[PDB]
Design a protein around this ligand. Structure first.
Ligand SMILES: NC[C@@H]1O[C@H](O[C@H]2[C@@H](O)[C@H](O[C@@H]3[C@@H](O)[C@H](N)C[C@H](N)[C@H]3O[C@H]3O[C@H](CO)[C@@H](O)[C@H](O)[C@H]3N)O[C@@H]2CO)[C@H](N)[C@@H](O)[C@@H]1O
Ligand SMILES: [Mg+2]
Ligand SMILES: [Mg+2]
Ligand SMILES: [Mg+2]
Ligand SMILES: [Mg+2]
Ligand SMILES: [Mg+2]
Ligand SMILES: [Mg+2]
Ligand SMILES: [Mg+2]
Ligand SMILES: [Mg+2]
Ligand SMILES: [Mg+2]
Lengths: 182, 183, 260
RNA sequence: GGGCGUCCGUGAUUUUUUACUGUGACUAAAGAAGCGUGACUAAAGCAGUCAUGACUGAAUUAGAAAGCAUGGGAUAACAAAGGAGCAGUUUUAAAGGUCUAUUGGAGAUUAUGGAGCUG
RNA sequence: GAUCUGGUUGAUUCUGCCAGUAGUCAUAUGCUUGUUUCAAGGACUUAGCCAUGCAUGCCUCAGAAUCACUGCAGCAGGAAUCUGCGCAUGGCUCAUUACAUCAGACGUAAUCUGCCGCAAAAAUCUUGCGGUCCGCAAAAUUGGAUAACUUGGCGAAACGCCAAGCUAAUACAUGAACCAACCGGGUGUCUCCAGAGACGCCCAGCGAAUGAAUGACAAAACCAAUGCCUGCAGUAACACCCAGCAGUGUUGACUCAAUUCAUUCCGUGCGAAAGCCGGCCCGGCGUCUUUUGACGAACAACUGCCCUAUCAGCUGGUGAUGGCCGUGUAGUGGACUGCCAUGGCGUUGACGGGAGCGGGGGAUUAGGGUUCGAUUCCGGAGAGGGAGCCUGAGAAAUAGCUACCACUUCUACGGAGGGCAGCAGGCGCGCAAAUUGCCCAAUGUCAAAACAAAACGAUGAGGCAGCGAAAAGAAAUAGAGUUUUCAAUGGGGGAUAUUUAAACCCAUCCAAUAUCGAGUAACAAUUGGAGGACAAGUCUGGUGCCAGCACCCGCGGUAAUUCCAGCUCCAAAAGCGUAUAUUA
C-alpha cells in the first residue's frame, strides 16, 4: 500500500475509431515496418506528439529566455542523438515537421533491416527477439529499441549467437545428439 | 468532567455548536477551594507537568505587608469584613483574593516601636531613630486602628491556588473607600 | 509525542530514496532542529559509506567512534547540523557540516587546526541566576560569560577543545554572511543593507562576489567573516557562487564528452 | 579648536488611505513539468561512470487566495465638505504677570537671567 | 488536434434534445489469456457481528542473584522477580463534523514541556569514642521494610487470592561538621572623636508566595553636615581589608530576565544516589534540584469553503454581547459564581435542514473551466454506543480502569469474563474486494541495549511470498529459400549453480573434459461486427411482423444488405464486449 513506484501510459487510442483514411495509413505502417499491432504506432504518435507540443511551447517563448536556451537545446540534442534530425536541422522548427515514419526508422527492427543483417523487416524482428543482435556487445531483445546515431556503427550479430561466434543452435544440436546415439 | 471550553457556549450568531469530540483532559477545571477561617488544613492538587497546586481550606494566618514601610509581618487573621463579590461570602467568612480582613496589629505596633522608636528609651547609644523619623510621617487612619487593636487589610494572594493568605494593609484612599462602605 | 518519521516527510536534503523502507531516523531533540539537521545514521551510512545498513551503523556509533564537536556521540539519531565538526579518530578524517550552494549539506574536509574552532550564532541573550549574562546559540550552547560586545545577531568563534570563546564577529554592514535558509541557502555574500521593520521580520540585502544581489530574512544570515576574502571558516568547493542553470548544464555535457 | 556630513536610540513640530501594477522575502515530500543517465528498451529509479581509487551526480521550474516589504500614480474606491456653515509675516525696544543648568558634591532656602504668556 | 456525426420534412432552412464517439490510478460483470516487469486490493452496503492464533516490551563492562539452577576449580553463565524507562508512538478506520476541522500565514509577552543538547550548583552542627550535656577526634563503616523463595494453602475456575517465615537496592527513608569564599540586613557591650573602629548576637543558598526599591537618561548667593587644597585648583563611586570585584539584561513592546530587603515555605521542592563499573590517582557512566535551547503539547483566530428561503429572524429567565471583583486553569478568557449594564448576529443569507473528514493531490482540459479526493504524506476525530477517571512529562488512553445501555462467552450455579474501524481469517451484507502464509535480512521504533564470545532483545510496524485481466510497461503464436528442404529460440524441462533471511522470480546456461527439446511448430487467439453513423458481403441455407435484432434510425408480413446459422471479410487484439457513475 505504501509503495511509491510510479507508472503512466505511453499510448493513446484515437478519437474516431473508424476513419477510412487513418486505417489505410496505419496498415501501411504495420506493413512497411513489421509491426505487431496498431498500439505500437500509437505510442510513436504520443512520443512525437509530446515533442511537437513542447517545441511549440518554446516558440511562444522568446529567444534569450531561460526555458528556451536550456530545454530547447535538450530537445534538439535528443533528435540529433537518436537520428530524428540530421545535424543541419538545428533551428527547433524541424521538430514540428517530424513524422511517424521518421521515428519508426530508428527502431532496431528497421536498422537491422537497413544495415543488411536480415533479408526482410520480418526477418529482423525475429532475429532481435531470438537473441541474435548486440548493439554494443549487449544482446538487445527489444524490437522497439530506438537506436542512437553512435550505436549504428556497432550493431552486429551477438557474440553468443550461433550466427556470430557462439555455439550452434537447436536444429543442429538436436541433430548432433541423434547422430550420437548411433 | 468540568471543562473550560467554548464547545457548550453558543456562537455570537446564537447558533448551537455541534460537538464532534470527547472532552479532553487538557481543558479541565476543578472544584473550588472555598477557603475559610480556621486552623490550617491543606490538600495538594497534582497539576500539569507534575507540579503541585496547594488548595487552602481553613486558613488563619498569613504574611501581611505594610507597603509604605516596605515590611511584612506574620500576623493572625481575625475576621472577614467586606467582600466585593457577595455579602454572602462575608457571612460564611470565605477567604478569596481581594477580600477585606482584619488582622492582629500587634507585630506592627511592636515593629513601630522597635523601628522609629515610637510607642502607643533603652538604647541610648543608637539614635539612628533620629536619622529617620523626620521626613517620614504616618497616616492618621492607620495609627487609629493600629492602636485600636485590629487593622483592616486586603488579601493579595490566591489561597485556593497557593495555599497562602498573604495580604497588604489598607492605606490612603483605599482604606477610606472601604471604611465608608462598612460604617 | 511523535517518535517516527516517514521517509516522505523526512527532509529532502538527506536524500533517502523513497523505495527503501517506510521510515527515516527521526532525530532526537538536542542541538539542532529536526527540519535542519542531518542525523548521524545518515552521515555514517548514506553520506560516508562506512556502513552498509543501520546494523553496521550502530556497530560504529555505539562503540564510541564518531565524535561530534570533540565528544563521542553514541546516538544514531543525534542531530548534527550546520557548523558542526565530525571527527573520526580511527579513519583519521574530520569534516564540517556546511551548506553547499545548492542548499544541501556538505562535508568539508578539515585539518587539525581548522577542526578545533567552530563558528556559532547567538540566538538569545539573557541574564541567569547570579548576575551572569549567558548567550544562547543556534547549536544549543549556553556560553556563560561571552564577550561583552555580544548582541543577538553576532557570531562567536568557540574552539570546542578548550571551551573558551576566542573571538567575536559583529553583525554590521561591512561583513560577509552565509545564508542558512530559504531559496538562497548556501550562498555567501557581503551585507549591503539591513531593513529593520520592527514587529516583523528584518530583511537583509546581500551582494555576492560576482555582484549578484539577493535578499533574505536576517534571521537566515550567518556572519562568517569580516569580508569575502577573510572568511573565518572554510566553505565548500563552489564557495557560495551560484552558477547559471544553463551554463552549469553545458559544462557537464562538455566534461562527459571530454572524458570519452 | 570650528565647518561638513553620516550611524544609532529619545523628545517637540499639522493630516491620507484602498483596489490596481512592477519587483522582491517567505512558502514539506510524494505528484506535475524536465536536466543528465542505453537499469537490454520502456513503465521506472536516483543512480552510477571510468582504469588496494578516481570524478562524482541527485541541476532547475510552476504550484490557489490571504499574510510581509518596497516604488509606479492612469483608472476607479473609501472618507469629508455643501463653501458666511469662513483658518499677516517679520525687525525693535517696553509694561504687567507665570509653575531645568551652573556656584567641588549632596541637602535646604534664594534673588538675577534664558525661552515662552498676554494687553 | 480550439474537429463533430446520425434521428422531426414530400424535400428545405432552423431551434432543440435524444443517439453515436473518446477518456477515468472508476467500479462491477460476461467471454477469453502463452511469457515477463510493475502494482491497487471489505472504502462505498453494515463505524455491522466476531470463533482461534498473533499484534509491546527492554540487561550492558557499568541498579538488585544464596534458584535448595548450571558448568569450572571462588570465578563465569544465569531462570525468576524487585527497580529504571516504554506502552500517549506506530497501525487501522472515516462515523462524527460548516465563526468546527483544514490550508497558507501569524500569535502565545496567556502557557505546560519527560527523553535529548549545552550549562548551573559554597543552604542543611552529621558521624566516631569517652564520660552526663561536655570533651577529644574525622576518607561519615546510616536505618527500617518488601518481592522472588520457602511453608501452609483457599478456589470448579479467573492475565484470581490469603497468612506466616527469609533477604537486596540506583526501591523507600534518613543524613553529612571543618576543610570552603565573597556579599548584605537588623542589632548590643568596647577602645576612640567633639561620629569612626573592634568584638558579640539574630538573619542572610537555588526555587516558590506576598510587599516595597531598581529594570535608566535623551549664571550665582547664603546656613548646616561633608570633599580634597595650604579660600577652592581637579574631580567615577566607597571611611581601611578589593584605591574600577557591574554606575550598563533583553525586546518592536513587558508588571518580564536579574538583583537588593521585608516576611515565611512545614511537605506539596533541592544527596556529593550513603550508586555502579573500568584502567594502572585517573577515566567511563548513573542520578536529585535549578535553568534554558530542542522535539512537542494546549489555546487564540487573518483570509478561504457544497446545496438549501416549500428555512427570515437568531441569541438573552438556566450566559446571550460587554463591564467589575473574584474563581478555576498549565495558562488567556462568560470558562465559571456574585453584581451591574442592554447588548450581539442577520437579505454582503444569520438561524435551521440535507449532503461528508480537511488539504497536498487525481481525471479531463486551447483558454476560461467541470468534476473526484474512504485511500499511502500532513492534520483532525474515534475504538461497540455514552460517560467518568487513575497513573504519568504527555491520555479524558481503550491489546488501561469504573459504571450503565445493547449484544456476549465459561461455570462444579457460588461465580468469572468479553470488545479485530491491528494482521490473517469467520458469518452476514451486498454489484462489489485476497493467505487463520514465511521472516526481522532491510526500513524503523522501543530500551538497561554495538557485534562477537556457553551467549541470536521484541515487533501481523514493516518486508517477503500466495491469491490478484483494478490500472500500467515490454512482448511470442514464426522466419529464409529452391510441391520441397535449410536454419532459428523461446513456452516448457532442468543445474557446478545464482538469487533470497530461506525459498520463489527474474538472469545466466544446455558443456567448461562432459548437459533436454517445435512442426498439423496439435505448443491450435479471442472478443465484438459486415444497411447508416462506423471499418467491412447486392454470398448461401432457415424462419415468415413469428422467433428475435436494433444505444438511435430502423430490420422481420415467403426472394431479410439487419434475425438464427455456414462461408468470407472488418476492427481492436492477450485481450474484447456490456451496465452505472463521471470529464470532454
Ligand atoms: N444548553 C447547554 C447549557 O446548559 C446549562 O444548563 C443545563 C443544566 O442546568 C442542566 O444540565 C444538566 C446538568 O447540570 C447535569 N449535570 C447533567 C444533566 N444531564 C443535564 O441535563 C440536561 O441533559 C440531559 C441529556 O441531554 C437532558 O435529559 C436533561 O433534560 C437536560 N436538562 O440543564 C440545562 C440544559 O438543558 C445552562 N442552561 C446553559 O449553560 C446552557 O443551556
Ligand atoms: Mg543464447
Ligand atoms: Mg516497574
Ligand atoms: Mg470538496
Ligand atoms: Mg478577570
Ligand atoms: Mg493519518
Ligand atoms: Mg446506547
Ligand atoms: Mg481484519
Ligand atoms: Mg437471405
Ligand atoms: Mg450473418
Amino acid at each position: 500500500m505504501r509503495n511509491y513506484n510510479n507508472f503512466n501510459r505511453v499510448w493513446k487510442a484515437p478519437r474516431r475509431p473508424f476513419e477510412k483514411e487513418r486505417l489505410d495509413r496505419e496498415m501501411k505502417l504495420c506493413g512497411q515496418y513489421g509491426l505487431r499491432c496498431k498500439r505500437e504506432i500509437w505510442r510513436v504518435n504520443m512520443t512525437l506528439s509530446k515533442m511537437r507540443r513542447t517545441a511549440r511551447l518554446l516558440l511562444t517563448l522568446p529567444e534569450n529566455h531561460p526555458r528556451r536556451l536550456l530545454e530547447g537545446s535538450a530537445i534538439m540534442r535528443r533528435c540529433h542523438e537518436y537520428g530524428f534530425l540530421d545535424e543541419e536541422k538545428d533551428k527547433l522548427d524541424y521538430v514540428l515537421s517530424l513524422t511517424v515514419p521518421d521515428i519508426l526508422e530508428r527502431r532496431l527492427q528497421t536498422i537491422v533491416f537497413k544495415a543488411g543483417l536480415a533479408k526482410s523487416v520480418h526477418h529482423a524482428r525475429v532475429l532481435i527477439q531470438q537473441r541474435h543482435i548486440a548493439v554494443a556487445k549487449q544482446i538487445v531483445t527489444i524490437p522497439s529499441f530506438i537506436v542512437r546515431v553512435s550505436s549504428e556503427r556497432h550493431i552486429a550479430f551477438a557474440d553468443a549467437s550461433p550466427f556470430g561466434n557462439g555455439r550452434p543452435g537447436r536444429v543442429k544440436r538436436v541433430r548432433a545428439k541423434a547422430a550420437k546415439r548411433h | 468532567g468540568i471543562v473550560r471550553s467554548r464547545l457548550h457556549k453558543r456562537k455570537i450568531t446564537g447558533g448551537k455548536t455541534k460537538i464532534h469530540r470527547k472532552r479532553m483532559k487538557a481543558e479541565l477545571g476543578r472544584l473550588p477551594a472555598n477557603t475559610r477561617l480556621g486552623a490550617r488544613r491543606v490538600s495538594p492538587v497534582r497539576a500539569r507537568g507534575g507540579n503541585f497546586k496547594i488548595r487552602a481550606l481553613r486558613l488563619d494566618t498569613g504574611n501581611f505587608a505594610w507597603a509604605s514601610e516596605a515590611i511584612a509581618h506574620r500576623v493572625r487573621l481575625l475576621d472577614v469584613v467586606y467582600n466585593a463579590t457577595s455579602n454572602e461570602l462575608v457571612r460564611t467568612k470565605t477567604l478569596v483574593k481581594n477580600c477585606i480582613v482584619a488582622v492582629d496589629a500587634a507585630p506592627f505596633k511592636r515593629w513601630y516601636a522597635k523601628h522609629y522608636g515610637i510607642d502607643l528609651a533603652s538604647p541610648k547609644l543608637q539614635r539612628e531613630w533620629i536619622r529617620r523619623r523626620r521626613n517620614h510621617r504616618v497616616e492618621k487612619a492607620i495609627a487609629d486602628q493600629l492602636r485600636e487593636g485590629r487593622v483592616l487589610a486586603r488579601i493579595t494572594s490566591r489561597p485556593g491556588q497557593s495555599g497562602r493568605a498573604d495580604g497588604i494593609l489598607l492605606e490612603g484612599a483605599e482604606l477610606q473607600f472601604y471604611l465608608k462602605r462598612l460604617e | 509525542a511523535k517518535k517516527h518519521l516517514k521517509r516522505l516527510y523526512a527532509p529532502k536534503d538527506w536524500m533517502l530514496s523513497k523505495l527503501t523502507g517506510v521510515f527515516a531516523p527521526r532525530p532526537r531533540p538536542g542541538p539542532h532542529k529536526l527540519r535542519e539537521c542531518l542525523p548521524l545514521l545518515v552521515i555514517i551510512r548514506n553520506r560516508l559509506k562506512y556502513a552498509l545498513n543501520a546494523r553496521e551503523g550502530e556497530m560504529i556509533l555505539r562503540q564510541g567512534l564518531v565524535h561530534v564537536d570533540n565528544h563521542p556521540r553514541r546516538d544514531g539519531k543525534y542531530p548534527a547540523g550546520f557548523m558542526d565538526v565530525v571527527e573520526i579518530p580511527k579513519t583519521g578524517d574530520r569534516f564540517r557540516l556546511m551548506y553547499d550552494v545548492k542548499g544541501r549539506f556538505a562535508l568539508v574536509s578539515l585539518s587539525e587546526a581548522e577542526a578545533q574552532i567552530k563558528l556559532m550564532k547567538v540566538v538569545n541573550l539573557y541574564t541567569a541566576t547570579g548576575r551572569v549574562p549567558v548567550a544562547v546559540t543556534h547549536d544549543g550552547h549556553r556560553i556563560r560569560y561571552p564577550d561583552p560586545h555580544t548582541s543577538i545577531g553576532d557570531t562567536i568563534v568557540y574552539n570546542v577543545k578548550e571551551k573558551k570563546c576566542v573571538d567575536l564577529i559583529k553583525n554590521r554592514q561591512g561583513k560577509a554572511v552565509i545564508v542558512t535558509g530559504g531559496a538562497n541557502r548556501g550562498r555567501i555574500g557581503e551585507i549591503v543593507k539591513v531593513e529593520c521593520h520592527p514587529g516583523a521580520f528584518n530583511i537583509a540585502h546581500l551582494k555576492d562576489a560576482s555582484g549578484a544581489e539577493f535578499a533574505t530574512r536576517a534571521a537566515n544570515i550567518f556572519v562568517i567573516g569580516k569580508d569575502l576574502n577573510h572568511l573565518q571558516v572554510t566553505v565548500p568547493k563552489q564557495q557560495g557562487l551560484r552558477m547559471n542553470v544553463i551554463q552549469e548544464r553545458e559544462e557537464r555535457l562538455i566534461a562527459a564528452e571530454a572524458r570519452k
